């Protein structure tokens, strides 16, 4: 509700930026500027290996940060538009849920802890597979299924 922000370019909404841990994250392929005045002035570092950008969170905004975790046991998880299924190392969404322009939304655990950031997905008849940015102890990885297209 408070931890997500809108990104606008020429009056159009292209994506969202999420405030997790002690950093501010945004997918790198999304154009535009950040709505909040204070965050707009920070300097970012880019890396085209992972399509990500990050920076350090200013002090007086620290109360709004979400929590995070790194364990991913099998089960059910939630996001804005319903439930998501994790089994076999992939994220499953019933087809038709999600349309382009909805990138940058977090995926939450059962207790509300953030586990992944979604950018795009692949097309299949009954169920769809996603491309996400996840992490582990002290590294970052990118999982991409065959034939995925950017949202």
Q: Give the pair of three-digit tokens for residue 45.
A: 């570092």
CB of 146 to other proteins, least distance (A): 17
| Closer CB to other proteins, 21 or 145, in the complex | 21
Rounded Cα–Cα distance for residues 47 and 45 (Å): 7
Is residue 94 at the binding interface for other proteins, with CB under 8 A as the rule? no
Q: Which of 17, 20, 107, 116 binds other proteins (CB under 8 A)?
A: 20
Per the residue annotation, which of 80, 103, 109, 138 is the catalytic one? 103
Cβ–Cβ < 8 Å for 15, 104: yes
Q: How far apart are the first and last CA of the chain?
A: 22
Rounded Cα–Cα distance for residues 18 and 47 (Å): 18
How many residues line the site for other proteins (CB under 8 A)?
Answer: 18
CB of 89 to other proteins, least distance (A): 16
CB of 43 to other proteins, least distance (A): 13
């Amino acid at each position: 509700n408070d931890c997500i922000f809108e990104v606008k370019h020429e009056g159009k909404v292209m994506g969202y930026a999420c405030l997790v841990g002690d950093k501010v994250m945004k997918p790198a392929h999304v154009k535009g500027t950040i709505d909040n005045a204070d965050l707009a002035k920070l300097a970012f570092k880019r890396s085209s290996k992972y399509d990500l950008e990050c920076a350090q969170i200013p002090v007086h905004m620290k109360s709004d940060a979400s929590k995070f975790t790194h364990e991913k046991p099998e089960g059910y998880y939630n996001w804005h538009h319903g439930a998501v299924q994790y089994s076999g190392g992939r994220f499953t969404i019933p087809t038709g849920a999600g349309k382009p322009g909805d990138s940058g939304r977090p995926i939450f655990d059962n207790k509300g802890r953030v586990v992944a950031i979604v950018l795009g997905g692949a097309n299949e008849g009954a169920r769809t597979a996603l491309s996400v940015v996840t992490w582990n102890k002290d590294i970052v990885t990118k999982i991409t299924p065959e034939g995925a297209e950017e949202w």
